[PDB]
Amino acid sequence: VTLCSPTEDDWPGMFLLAAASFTDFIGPESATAWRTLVPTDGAVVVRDSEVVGMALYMDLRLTVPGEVVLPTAGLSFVAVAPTHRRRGLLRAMCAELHRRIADSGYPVAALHASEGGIYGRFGYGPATTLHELTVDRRFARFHADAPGGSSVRLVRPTEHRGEFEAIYERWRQQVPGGLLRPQVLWDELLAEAKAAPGGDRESFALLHPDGYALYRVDRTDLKLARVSELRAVTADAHCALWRALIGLDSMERISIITHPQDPLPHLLTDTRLARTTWRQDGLWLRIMNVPAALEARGYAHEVGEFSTVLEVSDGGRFALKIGDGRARCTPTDAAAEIEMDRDVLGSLYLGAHRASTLAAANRLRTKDSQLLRRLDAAFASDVPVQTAFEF
Amino acid sequence: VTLCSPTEDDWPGMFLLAAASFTDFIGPESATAWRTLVPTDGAVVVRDSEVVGMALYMDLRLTVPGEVVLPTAGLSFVAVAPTHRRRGLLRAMCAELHRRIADSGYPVAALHASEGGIYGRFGYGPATTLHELTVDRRFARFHADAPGGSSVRLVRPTEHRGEFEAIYERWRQQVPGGLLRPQVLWDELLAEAKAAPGGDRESFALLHPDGYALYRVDRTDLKLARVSELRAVTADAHCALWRALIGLDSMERISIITHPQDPLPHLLTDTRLARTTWRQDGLWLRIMNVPAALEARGYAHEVGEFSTVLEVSDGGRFALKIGDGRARCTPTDAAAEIEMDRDVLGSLYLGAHRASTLAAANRLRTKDSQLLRRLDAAFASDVPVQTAFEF
Amino acid sequence: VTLCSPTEDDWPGMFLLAAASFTDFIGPESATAWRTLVPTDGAVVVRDSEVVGMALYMDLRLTVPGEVVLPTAGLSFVAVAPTHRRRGLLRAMCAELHRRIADSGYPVAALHASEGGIYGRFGYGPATTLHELTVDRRFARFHADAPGGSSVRLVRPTEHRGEFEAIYERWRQQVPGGLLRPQVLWDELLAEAKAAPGGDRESFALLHPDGYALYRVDRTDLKLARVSELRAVTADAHCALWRALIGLDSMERISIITHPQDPLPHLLTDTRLARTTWRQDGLWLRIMNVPAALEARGYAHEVGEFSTVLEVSDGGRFALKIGDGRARCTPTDAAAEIEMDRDVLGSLYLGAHRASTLAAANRLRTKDSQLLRRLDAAFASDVPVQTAFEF
Amino acid sequence: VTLCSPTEDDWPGMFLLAAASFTDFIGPESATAWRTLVPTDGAVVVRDSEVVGMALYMDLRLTVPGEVVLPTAGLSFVAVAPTHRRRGLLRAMCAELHRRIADSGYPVAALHASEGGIYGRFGYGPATTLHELTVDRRFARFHADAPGGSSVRLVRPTEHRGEFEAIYERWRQQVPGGLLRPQVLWDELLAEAKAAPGGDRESFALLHPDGYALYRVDRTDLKLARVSELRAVTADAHCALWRALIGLDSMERISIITHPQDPLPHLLTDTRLARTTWRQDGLWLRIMNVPAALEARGYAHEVGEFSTVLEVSDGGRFALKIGDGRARCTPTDAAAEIEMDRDVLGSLYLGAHRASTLAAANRLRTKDSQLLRRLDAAFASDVPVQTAFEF
């Protein structure tokens, strides 16, 4: 019907659509807390009267390679009523928000995808990889070389908020994929930590000066401990926390949603005991401003200075010069040496996907295999890309 | 009791131990064919009279980064009788074969591990990663950018041996992890292709000028096609074969044991449809001669010349200079800048594991983070490491 | 229609009824081998022309407490056509065979029951207990006290028939529940040992001078080894064989159908690792001649001489005197002190069930609790009752 | 760090360790009620400041054969923080409590084991056997001989506390394994009887003058009734209650955790319908004072007077004379005829395990098989050993 910024009167209608669209809907109280991260004009609704479509973005701070922090539009709360499918409501809402996001001066937008087949056509590429490890801790023995053969304390999460906040803040600034976690999201996290009748069990924390793990026993599998979050600033902290987790003698299995480069398997005499049980796209990126994004991040120092011409499909053509870990990215009408869709650049941006891999799928086109190797090396992240928290 | 090279009289006793030790035992006829790959003095047995221990190596040819082919001792048929456990028979047999392998002039030994917790202590490190992808082909749609939007033929494997041989030979020479597949292993492969009463179903082949896929419907899950092997020399061949496999309209799912950098997910509009259902160590490497191995392989051209001192624990100390994609590796008593166990070098050698990841687990020790980045970049493989065939 | 001893012409019709009645039917060749154990007049058929009912008994030798061996009628191959149910054919056939068995001079009849609710009314009581133990052998560690901390050999069963025969013969004579295993059943056992296409895997043997285990990997669960049979004459042999079985390092689990008093759990540091996964009635006994049966077996020496009057319902009344491990059992019309149905006496006879337990269910009636304790102690078996082989 | 009796200030720290260690943790309110059973100096904590280890014992009254009631130290609430494993904290805490328990004058200590591989080395032997029976009540028909072919009432548990208390008190005094159930544990039991939102369903009671059953429908399997507790003083009460339970016509299955000698199967025309679905060690015993324990219990009258010399490993050597159902147990330096570890004596003490079975595992050593038979008969319990309630 019409596409508008919602009034205060629209939010009950938005909560109804949310409840009907999201099985994990956090409820009106929690949703109202997350609103404090939505700027003025950060939300659109379609009315037919009742809300049949909604989408918004939150003001986020995303760490990219080089420990550079970018202002980031975090898309969220995106729903079309089941009564109004195949009516181009998602396309209309995504076009309006992208317009507002671009005009506001955000260099990147980000989201978590409900399905993998939807956001590629709006220029979002999967930029981090979720990697679930399940450890059969009954067989787990630490390698002779593993650090810390206690510095770790078993604590109530709500009693050590200050220490978790300070450790997380250090973590998010040093890791590509890191997000600033504002105070309202700490309020929400520590509320979810407590037990619920017929719901999740009590959360516990393992606290080190340079890391923490939040974990809870699974609702139904009482021999599975699920680590909701492990933030370690040092290798010593990461090993110490895993020694403590393998010490949960009443559990058969410890599971964590981590990143592909988690060193956990190498801490054990049997690397195979850390089984990959699940893999999925994590954070998705849409590069809003190609030159601003490419100039902002740091590049591998190991690759020698090189120049090329990059065309993003309907996204501009640029003279790209990378040397001394920095990029210069300027307008040109010179012949393109590399072509890709905007989504592909998003997938390269945090170093989670190799240019060579995307080239092999013809998502990235060049006639120079030397240029491909140089892109691969340059866009690689020294610190492996991790996922911060879902939004 | 005693450790000897087996006589012809010992092989029936070895087949009994094999049958009792290996649920996948290929049987005496097939085992006798695989013997033709075992050199004179390539086998040891422990007798108590009956065979209570055995181990052997086969003469293999392994492709490493730089399209360099190394003579490789492939350990196989390693068994201790259940009556003679915890008697140091494995250690005795592994020490004797390694002695023979080293003296024979092999720069590397390789194996497939029955368990992950066993071969690390004998200096084997996991060097390739098996990555099972399962595609729900009912939802699978190819991306607009994907090549070849037919060059592929559905054929009987036994009728196109010459073409499979020629395609495989091109594949194995261009890919790190590639093994020469001798004639006896082609005889064995095409025998396993045929249907067995109460066994596997008939194997089919999809044949392209520059690639093939061997597949069969699963024994019990009649909606699952299992790709036993897909060898593609070009991206066009890889895409064409996957278009054909997604055309198996009577199947719900196509599964393949592939490598982490398989571009398949990027060929689809929904990358998530190519689900990682399983991950395990593939080929394990023991570097027998550190300087011969390190000098033999090619290194990334992107990293500028650098020099360091590498100590392998009880494996020598070496002045290591890497530049122009080549390494020089000479004896030194100069202070070590990098320390690691022999197994760790095996894990780095084909580029499947990052020095940075192993350093984070303290399996690789240095005080210079710049040196770590340079090792990471140098040991990286341009062509992603794949697994050839199990032995 | 009519009840007759079958002619040679009837056996094809009997094999058809067998095939249709028994999913485990051994087939006409094996059935013809088992016939050699059926005496002249050991079989009845009901014809309607076609066979609609059959039953037979084999000449067996059953060991009872005191190492006494009784001639035993082993009922088997009992079937009523699905076309002729609820026509009293089973009752007619059981009455005729029991008549022949009694007149032939057998003191006891025995069977394995297809269902638990059928044979009680014909005077059969469950006399042995099948107890399946499943060991998670990955955690299994032997106790410091366990014997034999090798005497055991891994062998092909067919190559050591003489040794298995000799060990079994010693076992069956010393254990209540022991059956003589004739030559035709050894022929049949060693034929079932070999692998079958789309059937069972190859059987292996662990051979000690004073015991053997026959085992095979499960058809479908390739991490489960099933022990079909373990016959140990000494505790040393039993422990040595279990050390070897726990040495099957490619298995997660070892299962055995054993007896409730199997000492296996006490050999381990964690008794709980030997899990009871299944329990069922094994051998069923019908006491044909009460005085002959009661006088034949040995009794506990620990109980002092006592006298009572036992009435079996429609089975006679007897003055029963037990002292010095022997019983005298003579006719009397004196008042009964103990009453029970014939089936209950069968359940007491091998010591598998306590008189006190059966009394608590009112299956055994007396007004003297002292008499109950004395029966309990007297009928107890020093050597625990085991099950020999199914028939 | 240090091992102390806890102050009131320590109990919040103990509740945190409890919550993190025990998935079935009863919560601080219930735990505070169970404290009333812990004597002054009945608890130890290890502090590192925070609680990293705890253990306590409760004052219990345990019935042993001969209807003799022993003061019993019931170990419970035993936990080591996952941060402080493999630091000998359990050994230190168990040594201190055993010292206090011995000095206080308890002849026996008892516990329920979280795992089977832990308490044997501290002298605890499994002394009762939990036996789960599952009845498919749709097929269940009572035998002609079964008593009571109504005396039973369906009631709300909270309304008949006095009658349950009085029946239980009669039960616990007449059965080996019986525990006095104090008022606080009746308060706790009847609170657990009520329904919980997203928790257990409402409990019902079947009440007979001489027995009760407490049962509830399973949370998730709505065709399974679980009997939490059935206490029957007479066989008539036991049968009447089972007739009522088989009358739960909306259920497919009735399950109960009972003892191996439960007469239930013998009440049915098909004994096989009472399936053993689970078997585990119940109560564990550590004999603190060998002579006090052995002299306290009654022995079988059926065995004639005999004398032997018993050595408990690091537990004393004793002249043991058993006659007229009583034992005299005095110091001696005479040659040992029987040797066993302390844990083994615990396993024999309530008659749940036969000396012959433990001898077959070499956990009990003698050279006289006649002595073995006499021990077997003497330590046997006339009334079968049952399990009271878990602690």
Ligand SMILES: O=C(CCCN1CC=C(n2c(=O)[nH]c3ccccc32)CC1)c1ccc(F)cc1
């Ligand atoms: O509603 C959102 C975004 C929140 C997305 N959620 C995504 C992730 C979360 N969760 C988890 O990660 N595990 C959970 C289990 C139960 C419930 C929620 C879980 C929580 C948030 C919202 C609402 C109103 C706004 F203005 C702006 C935004």
Ligand SMILES: O=C(CCCN1CC=C(n2c(=O)[nH]c3ccccc32)CC1)c1ccc(F)cc1
């Ligand atoms: O026995 C071997 C090594 C073969 C290892 N196998 C390892 C891998 C194989 N397989 C598969 O990959 N899938 C299979 C399914 C059923 C049976 C075998 C399968 C086949 C070979 C041997 C025997 C005698 C020698 F002298 C030297 C060596």
Ligand SMILES: O=C(CCCN1CC=C(n2c(=O)[nH]c3ccccc32)CC1)c1ccc(F)cc1
């Ligand atoms: O047919 C019988 C009695 C045999 C009863 N069976 C009962 C037990 C056996 N089996 C097992 O124990 N496991 C088996 C697996 C597959 C097939 C058979 C199995 C084998 C025998 C027979 C036939 C003709 C006669 F004259 C007299 C008697």
Ligand SMILES: O=C(CCCN1CC=C(n2c(=O)[nH]c3ccccc32)CC1)c1ccc(F)cc1
């Ligand atoms: O915490 C204990 C011992 C209690 C052991 N539990 C063991 C057995 C029980 N349970 C069951 O049997 N089924 C249950 C289901 C849900 C919750 C508890 C269940 C309850 C008690 C304690 C606490 C403080 C003390 F001072 C002294 C002692």
